[PDB]
Amino acid sequence: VSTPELKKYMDKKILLNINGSRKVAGILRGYDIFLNVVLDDAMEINNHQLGLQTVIRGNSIISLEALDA
Amino acid sequence: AHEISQGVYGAVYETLISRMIFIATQLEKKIRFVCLSNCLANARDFGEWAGMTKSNIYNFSPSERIEPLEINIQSFKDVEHISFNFSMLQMAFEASAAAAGNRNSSSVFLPSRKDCMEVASAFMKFSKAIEWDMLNVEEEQIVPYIEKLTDGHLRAPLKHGVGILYKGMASNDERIVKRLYEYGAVSVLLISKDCSAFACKTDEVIILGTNLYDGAEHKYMPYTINELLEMVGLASGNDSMAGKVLILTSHNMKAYYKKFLIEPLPTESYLQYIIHDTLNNEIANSIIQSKQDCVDWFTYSYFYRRIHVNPSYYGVRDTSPHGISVFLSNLVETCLNDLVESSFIEIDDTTEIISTLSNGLIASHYGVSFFTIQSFVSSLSNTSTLKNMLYVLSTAVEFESVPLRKGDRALLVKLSKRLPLRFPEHTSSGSVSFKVFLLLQAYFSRLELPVDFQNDLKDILEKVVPLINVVVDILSA
Amino acid sequence: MKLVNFLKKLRNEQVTIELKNGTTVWGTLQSVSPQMNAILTDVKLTLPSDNIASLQYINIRGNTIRQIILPDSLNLDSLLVDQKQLNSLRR
Amino acid sequence: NGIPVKLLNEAQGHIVSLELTTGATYRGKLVESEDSMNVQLRDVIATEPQGAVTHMDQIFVRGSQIKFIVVPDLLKNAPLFK
Amino acid sequence: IQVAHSSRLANLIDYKLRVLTQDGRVYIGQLMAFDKHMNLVLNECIEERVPKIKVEKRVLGLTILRGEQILSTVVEDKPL
Amino acid sequence: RAELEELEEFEFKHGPMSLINDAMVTRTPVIISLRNNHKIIARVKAFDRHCNMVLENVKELWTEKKGKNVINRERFISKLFLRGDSVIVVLKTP
Amino acid sequence: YFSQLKFEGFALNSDIVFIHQNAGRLLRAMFEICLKRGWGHPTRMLLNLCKSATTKMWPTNCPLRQFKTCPVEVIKRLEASTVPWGDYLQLETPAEVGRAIRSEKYGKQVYDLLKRFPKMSVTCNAQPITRSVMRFNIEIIADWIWDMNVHGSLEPFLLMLEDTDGDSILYYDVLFITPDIVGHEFTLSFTYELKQH
Amino acid sequence: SSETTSLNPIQSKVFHAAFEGDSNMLICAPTGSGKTNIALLTVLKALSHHYNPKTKKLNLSAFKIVYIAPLKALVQEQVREFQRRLAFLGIKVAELTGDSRLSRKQIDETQVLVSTPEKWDITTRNSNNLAIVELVRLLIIDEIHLLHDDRGPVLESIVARTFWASKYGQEYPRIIGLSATLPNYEDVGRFLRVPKE
Amino acid sequence: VLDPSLRKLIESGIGTHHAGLTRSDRSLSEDLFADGLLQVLVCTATLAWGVNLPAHTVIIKGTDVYSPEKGSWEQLSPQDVLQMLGRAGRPRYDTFGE
Amino acid sequence: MVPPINCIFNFLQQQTPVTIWLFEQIGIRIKGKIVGFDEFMNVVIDEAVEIPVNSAKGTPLGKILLKGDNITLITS
RNA sequence: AUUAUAAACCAGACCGUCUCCUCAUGGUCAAUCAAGACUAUGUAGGGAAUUUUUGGA
């Protein structure tokens, strides 16, 4: 019920470490209470682009280092 | 006509006699009455009500009977809250074997099939260790008689000189059992209270338990003396100039039965209660159009001609030909002014008029209690569903004549698993209503009903057809 | 209603609960919670006969359990269908 | 309410270490605490089981996937209890 | 191990408990704060490892635990 | 309060549980599945909301193969309490 | 023993131990005897005595005491206040109770523990069957709310019928009010013969 | 705790007898000399006829043991011992929570009773406790030499009950007299239906 | 919790136990022999009747017990005396009993 | 700013191209077009095609309603 | 002068002697311009599908 304080992380490119050796990155356009991150970039690891904006399920998102601190 | 006391299903009967009498003095008709009955203490009064003269009115003592009966009454501690105890059982056994060792044949009375079963095994146990466990007959003779085995629970008890009798066996089986007693084969017969009608004449009569459980009030009652009478009523055929009843009672109800088996049964009306329905019926038939018509009707009845003797029974403090009249008037007012609250009748000033509405009329036609009709009225409405209707039906007053034995609630609950519909949230689980609801389904869905419940179901079905008609044609109205 | 209401009644019975990862643990149930949290006084172990790892008093997180067996061999069940009804006494 | 949550809240502004499902441990500051145990950090050290340790600026962690969280010894008896 | 017929979690608060997790990493620590999820805060942490034989040791923290991946809790040796 | 949950009682007999309800009513053998390479058989007795079920006369059928083999071990179990999360597929056999 | 006066000089305490183990017995026996005789004065008093023995408190010690769960401060307040206990029972609102338990705290609790107390708006008209005989139609309502910790498997109630004086029992009975009974307007009948005079 | 791993001078003679034949036995032998052990042995022997060696499931409902110690303290002491030496078969050896007569059904579910002679008498006299005595196969009578003091009238009564009363079951349970050394061992034997065996 | 003026005796090291010592106090008196330390236990008959506790030496003072049964001073009843003696020697540890 | 409960609405409206991701096998991933308004993460997706993506490919499929638990990516 | 020790009635099998958490309930308190800790009722609920206890083995 308590909203994740991700207004801090808004409009900054983030270097995620999602479930199962998957390093993806993208800007935080929108967030939510469930943690289904509505982000605006998708590229894999060297590098290659796959899909522009991407909404991920919050259950499979764990670690998220903001590139710009 | 002793049974015009017992409850109200009495007062019903009472009503009819009164009605007949009334008819006789409205058809100027030479109708004959033959009011056969028990010994009644008051009975001259009754006769006087029933259009008779002191000549024709033959009330006797119960000692005037002819196979003279020695009633032994036996009271026990800790019994008033149970059907029978172990001491009682022991006593019965002692008395049972006393008959079997002699040429005489005894029969035990009990509350229900479960009770009979309990007795049977216990009886067998008692026997095995003691000399007597004989059938007066070989072990290979009886098996030919009980080839059918339905119910199989009877077989094993029946096999060692101790038979069973409960309400609603396989008729053939019942017949066979009867034959086995009459013929002289089976030694002792266990009988459920409901089977008093099945008059197998015995010499000694054990009455194990003068106390009967009922979900009625969630408690043990007492065999109301009429029931008991059947066993004083059935006497010895073999040993002439001898009759015997062992009775297994509470200390409390010694003094009831010690009085009221050897003296005449006192006769009192229960009309007081039902008048609502009876009165309504009368109104519908339209002889009643006033608050004096009702009085007149009453005067042609046993209530009025009884009340003058014991009026404190019926709450008449004044007791004067004015006071009594006033009381009667009050009673009739009470009766009416429920029937105006419920949609039964209408009254206006000009001697002053009384007439039905559908609700009343339907009740009159189908013979369902004002109480029941009232109940029906409120719960049934526009857009009531089938389940709702069923529920309504199941809370008719009618079913107070339906036994709910020890552990029957549990059984019902267990059964509830296999039912199509489900009962409402806001009612009782101990009540007869619940039983009715499930035992309407019990035969809608062709289920395996226990033989106890079968009887209950049958009883319910005796009632339902008027009730269902009422339901349909209250909605129609 | 629920089958956790079944194990609610069984105070103080001996069980050897198969947990999901695989274990044999003889112990007294005591009181179980409506989230299946049982409390076990005496215990035998198996870390991943099977070797005794020398623990005595466990308290279970109700997520862990696969199969509970051998406290008692009975069949008695219902309760709430009785209680709702006998409280409807007066309106 | 749940006392551990309260404790966590109290320790906002402490050098809290961590351990996840995989075992990727951390040790940085506590930025914020919530009812569901979502955490953010500053100047965070990354010391994974893989061996390749790194130094990260900020990091945010999902509460559900936590195994446990480390706290210093100062808020032991008081002031959270009574 | 010396631990009596302890009825409930509230009656065994502040005891040095072994704690067990999903992966197999065994713990020891003094029980501080009961919870809905059994997020039981330990007075001190010493986690132990076994490779996929024999047990190892660690000592980093004095932790607020999280209940999700716990198995069960066992008493080791009471205080005082 | 009473109506909102108790209406779901008939939802057993209509919904996907209906089969297992029926089975429970008239005890019959069913294949009982699990997470880690498991196969289990028994007849149904008591039934719940979330598959936390109870049975009778139970047979476990499973393998401990240390080296590319199959060793179908078998043992009799009775009056269990399987946590319904572990159950996957159940079916009424003739 | 009745008043709970555990002792210093233990010889007395040893002596009192005996009484404790055997008072309730003897008192009960006496009560039974009285009942058998048919004697009101002792038997009601004897019943009271028996109750006291059972529950270690006096008549004037306010009944709440015999619940496990009511608190000590409340009971003291109740005791001194010199209110006819029944009055408290009669009270409707938990707020009211709180106000009049010298403790607006726990008021609700106490209320819960007054609808947890036995209490019956009994009615009984007798009807004379015949000259000697008298049926007595009793209508017992059980107004309280049961609890399987508190009220037990059943709630016995030794019903006396007794004379205009209160000297002699006429007829008596034990009846067990069960959970099932409670609230149901439930009848009970008995017949009583009479004395010539 | 098989310390010696070998029975005392008393039991070594009695042991075979105890195990051999179900007779009404009795031992007058020095105070604190393996009486408890003897009792245990007897119990075990009794259990042999109900509990199976193949089917190790303990046969609960059939046998019910009674132990007549004189003193409540003694009973308490012995109960613990019983628990110790028969928790392996898993026997629930309780002394009696008496309380009420119709309530005395806890005892019916219990396997072993250690009860005081007076208490036993109360139990065995009351009506809906006749079921108990039939399930009683093992009446063990500790410190019978009490008989000489005014207590052991109760023991005598008990003995009488055991023989004379239960004839509608008629299946007389095994008696085991236990006592300190005293003469008129012949008389006692005669009383208890004890042969030279 | 030692009430009477027996606590002094206990301190000295020659205590007692009787019906008339508190449930705990009396238990203590028992257990102050079983822990070991009580050198001498004065008493009245209770111990012999009830509790097993054997002690290598046992004296019995007096002859005339006053029964309320008679309302008179009797002599010691043998059924009691024998029981008292039966404490005698420590069966488990020691050789014989005085 | 874009909330996910209104994102579903947008998806419903536009009828966009999609590439859904799975949990267990990282290699197999679905492709299609999302359809349904829902409270759970569960959504129906017509023209489903499971593809083996290059882990460090001619395989088609039918039409799917994938469970809200096992969804790991959505692109629109 | 002055007295050993010692066991004990009664309601129970047709029957849930006994709950860890959240929500509501009225009665309180601790309090700021509409919100938090306590007794007490069980009359609510606990696959709120994802932040824990019902499935990533």
Swiss-Prot record, chain C:
Keyword Ribonucleoprotein annotated: yes
Broad class of where this protein is predominantly found: nucleus
Keyword RNA-binding tagged: yes
GO biological process: 7-methylguanosine cap hypermethylation; mRNA 5'-splice site recognition; mRNA splicing, via spliceosome; spliceosomal complex assembly; spliceosomal snRNP assembly; U2-type prespliceosome assembly
GO function term, MF aspect, one: RNA binding
Localization, UniProt: Nucleus; Cytoplasm
Chain ranges of the Sm domain: 2-74
Protein family (similarity comment): Belongs to the snRNP core protein family.
General remark: Present with 2400 molecules/cell in log phase SD medium.
Protein name: Small nuclear ribonucleoprotein Sm D1
Native organism: Saccharomyces cerevisiae (strain ATCC 204508 / S288c) (Baker's yeast)
Gene: SMD1
First-to-last residue of the parent protein present: 1 to 118 of 146
Swiss-Prot record, chain E:
Signal peptide: none
Domain text: C-terminal extension may function as a nuclear localization signal (NLS).
Similarity annotation: Belongs to the snRNP SmB/SmN family.
Record gene name: SMB1
Subunit structure: Component of the Sm core complex, present in spliceosomal snRNP U1, U2, U4/U6 and U5. The core complex contains SMB1, SMD1, SMD2, SMD3, SME1, SMX3 and SMX2 (Sm proteins B, D1, D2, D3, E, F and G, respectively), and is probably a heptameric ring structure. SMB1 specifically interacts with SMD3.
Entry function: Plays a role in pre-mRNA splicing as a core component of the spliceosomal U1, U2, U4 and U5 small nuclear ribonucleoproteins (snRNPs), the building blocks of the spliceosome.
All copies of domain Sm, residue ranges: 4-79
Superkingdom of the organism of origin: Eukaryota
Name this polypeptide is given: Small nuclear ribonucleoprotein-associated protein B
Other observations noted: Present with 861 molecules/cell in log phase SD medium.
UniProt organism field: Saccharomyces cerevisiae (strain ATCC 204508 / S288c) (Baker's yeast)
Record localization: Nucleus; Cytoplasm
Swiss-Prot record, chain H:
Misc. comment: Present with 1440 molecules/cell in log phase SD medium.
Part of the whole protein covered: 493 to 689 of 2163
Domain notes: Contains two helicase domains. The N-terminal helicase domain has catalytic activity by itself, contrary to the C-terminal helicase domain that may have a regulatory role and enhance the activity of the first helicase domain.
Subunit structure: Component of the U4/U6-U5 tri-snRNP complex composed of the U4, U6 and U5 snRNAs and at least PRP3, PRP4, PRP6, PRP8, PRP18, PRP31, PRP38, SNU13, SNU23, SNU66, SNU114, SPP381, SMB1, SMD1, SMD2, SMD3, SMX2, SMX3, LSM2, LSM3, LSM4, LSM5, LSM6, LSM7, LSM8, BRR2 and DIB1. Interaction with PRP8 is important for recruitment to the U4/U6-U5 tri-snRNP complex.
Location in or out of the cell: Nucleus
UniProt: ATP binding residues: A29, P30, T31, G32, S33, G34, K35, T36
Protein name: Pre-mRNA-splicing helicase BRR2
Motif (DEIH box): 142-145
Family: Belongs to the helicase family. SKI2 subfamily.
Function in brief: RNA helicase that plays an essential role in pre-mRNA splicing as component of the U5 snRNP and U4/U6-U5 tri-snRNP complexes. Involved in spliceosome assembly, activation and disassembly. Mediates changes in the dynamic network of RNA-RNA interactions in the spliceosome. Catalyzes the ATP-dependent unwinding of U4/U6 RNA duplices, an essential step in the assembly of a catalytically active spliceosome.
Domain Helicase ATP-binding span(s) in chain numbering: 16-197
Swiss-Prot record, chain J:
InterPro entries: LSM_dom_sf, Sm, Sm_dom_euk/arc, snRNP-E
Any one of the GO BP annotations: spliceosomal snRNP assembly
GO cellular component: commitment complex; cytoplasm; nucleus; pICln-Sm protein complex; precatalytic spliceosome; spliceosomal complex; U1 snRNP; U2 snRNP
Stated family: Belongs to the snRNP Sm proteins family.
Note in the entry: Present with 556 molecules/cell in log phase SD medium.
PANTHER family for this protein: SMALL NUCLEAR RIBONUCLEOPROTEIN E
Protein name: Small nuclear ribonucleoprotein E
Gene designation per UniProt: SME1
